[PDB]
Ligand binder design. Structure first.
Ligand SMILES: CO[C@H](C)CNC(=O)c1c(C)[nH]c(/C=C2\C(=O)N=C3CC=C(C(=O)N[C@H](C)c4ccccc4)C=C32)c1C
Length: 502
């Protein structure tokens, strides 16, 4: 499904083109060998050539598997690792684990096996690879190949890069097309913004804020930005495509008015992770409502409309009285200063509404003016039913606490205080973040879930081009990496990596 000359569009440059890169990129280990998905793969490929480092990569792989193993099938697994990488004469015996380290873990095996038994060991591993092996890789042909991939990443993105298909979505100050990259065939959703209405609205700032926040965050539960290009009378965002309808549709149109508690638990957990990934950047969402929680092809969720989000300066507060009637926290209605707390109020509204099939302050079959809806948020105490377990009631009224200081999650602990709540007592967040828990509803793929110069400066800061992490993932998903990342026969330098003949 790619272009037919895509092997020439993504053709590697000659290594000689990458001297300007090599000179400026920071040689940070956690970036070049872990965060950057293609840098990670290339560094692991480096360790596979040397017999001495091969055993270290395989040990970390086994630990990654151990953090998600079920509790009952856990110690079983712990012994297998103990008797493979850390025995006296093991075939893959790793040395930088001091005899003291192994003795503390082999005795830790006897007690209640923990999911982070090997956390101590794993850090000693990275410590070793951070130094000696990493500096080898920096002077190895694989880093030269990594530099190539960067060169491609930075190539300019235009209208020709993409391929407009259809209007799959609409509304706001623009549309939502379903665009595709001609080169790799990966599908996206383009948030085309009109280039004139932004000028009259003088909202250039919020347009750049949304793009900056999307670029910064890279969560599994929030829509990711991969490209930001300007075009002829439009500035575009290329976001994660979501072909599974919104959560509002599945509460009322599909299924009974509402879900079972176990089904609402799954969505609430994923949404709580999305909010956590945003709060790490002291960024508040302020727009939690069912029609903004979207579902993908597999049954997982992502938060969608960040147009009302802002990045709070650490230690300071904000004042905006924005949002949607019925989903505004009381401190927002009162036009007070707040932090991240509105998002936890919003979470409570979603958990309540998924279980009870209606808003906690508005009856699904009740006609009330907006003023009375607000007063209920500030005064009245919501009521529950037999649909809620004791744990379900608890967390709801805790997240729906009027006083934003006693509200669950609005403390110094953060999202951790919510994951601890007995309502998630049966939720293994560690396996959820790894995508090992089966979503409860799998959408069918055939379904249909229905002129100045002061601006020239603003334009340049916006159209920054491709985003590093999402771009590299695309190259891996589309198998363009597996196909182009070819070297020489019998461990020899390819033509594009030897400097003796350009
Ligand atoms: C006849 O029924 C069909 C189902 C019709 N197609 C749709 O309804 C259909 C599909 C398939 N995607 C989407 C939508 C999305 C998506 O997929 N990913 C994302 C990521 C982010 C947004 C987002 O920021 N929005 C906000 C509100 C926005 C504000 C201003 C301007 C544009 C957008 C939307 C989407 C929609 C509707």
């Amino acid at each position: 499904g790619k272009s037919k000359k895509w092997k020439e569009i993504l053709k590697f440059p000659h290594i000689s083109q990458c001297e300007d890169l090599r000179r400026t990129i920071d040689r940070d280990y956690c970036s070049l060998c872990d965060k950057q998905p293609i840098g990670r793969l290339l560094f692991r490929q480096f360790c596979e050539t040397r017999p001495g480092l091969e055993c270290y990569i395989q040990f970390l792989d086994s630990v990654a598997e151990y953090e998600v193993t079920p509790d009952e099938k856990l110690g079983e697994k712990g012994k297998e690792i103990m008797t493979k990488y850390l025995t006296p004469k093991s075939p893959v015996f790793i040395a930088q684990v001091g005899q003291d380290l192994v003795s503390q873990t082999e005795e830790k095996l006897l007690q209640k096996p923990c999911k982070e038994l090997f956390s101590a060991c794993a850090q000693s591993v990275h410590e070793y690879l951070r130094g000696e092996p990493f500096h080898e890789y920096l002077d190895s042909m694989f880093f030269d190949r990594f530099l190539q991939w960067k060169w491609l990443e930075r190539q300019p993105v235009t209208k020709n890069t993409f391929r407009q298909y259809r209007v799959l979505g609409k509304g706001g100050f623009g549309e939502v097309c379903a665009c595709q990259v001609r080169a790799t065939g990966k599908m996206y959703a383009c948030k085309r913004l009109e280039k004139k209405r932004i000028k009259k609205r003088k909202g250039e700032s919020m347009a750049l804020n949304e793009k900056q926040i999307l670029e910064k965050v890279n969560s599994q539960f929030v829509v990711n930005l991969a490209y930001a290009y300007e075009t002829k009378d439009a500035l575009c965002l290329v976001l994660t495509i979501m072909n599974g309808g919104d959560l509002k549709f599945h509460i009322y149109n599909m299924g009974n008015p509402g879900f079972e508690e176990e089904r609402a638990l799954f969505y609430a957990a994923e949404i709580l992770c999305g909010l956590e990934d945003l709060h790490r950047e002291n960024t508040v969402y302020r727009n939690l409502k069912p029609e903004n929680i979207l579902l993908d092809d597999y049954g997982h969720i992502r938060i969608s409309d960040l147009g009302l989000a802002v990045k709070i300066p650490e230690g300071d507060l904000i004042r905006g009285r924005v949002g949607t009637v019925g989903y505004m926290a009381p401190e927002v209605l009162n036009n007070q200063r707040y932090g991240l707390s509105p998002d936890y109020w919003g979470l409570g509204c979603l958990i309540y509404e998924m279980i009870e099939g209606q808003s906690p302050f508005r009856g699904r079959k009740e006609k009330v003016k907006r003023e009375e809806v607000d007063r209920r948020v500030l005064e009245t105490e919501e009521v529950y039913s037999h649909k809620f377990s004791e744990e379900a009631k608890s967390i709801c009224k805790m997240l729906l606490t009027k006083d934003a200081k006693q509200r669950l999650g609005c403390q110094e602990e953060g999202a951790a205080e919510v994951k601890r709540h007995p309502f998630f007592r049966n939720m293994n967040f560690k396996r959820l973040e790894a995508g090992m828990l089966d979503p409860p509803f799998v959408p069918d793929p055939r379904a249909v879930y229905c002129l100045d110069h002061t601006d020239d400066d603003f334009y340049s800061k916006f159209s920054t081009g491709s985003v590093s992490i999402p771009w590299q993932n695309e190259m891996i998903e589309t198998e363009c990496f597996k196909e182009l990342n070819v070297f020489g026969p019998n461990g020899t330098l390819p033509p594009d990596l030897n400097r003796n003949h350009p």
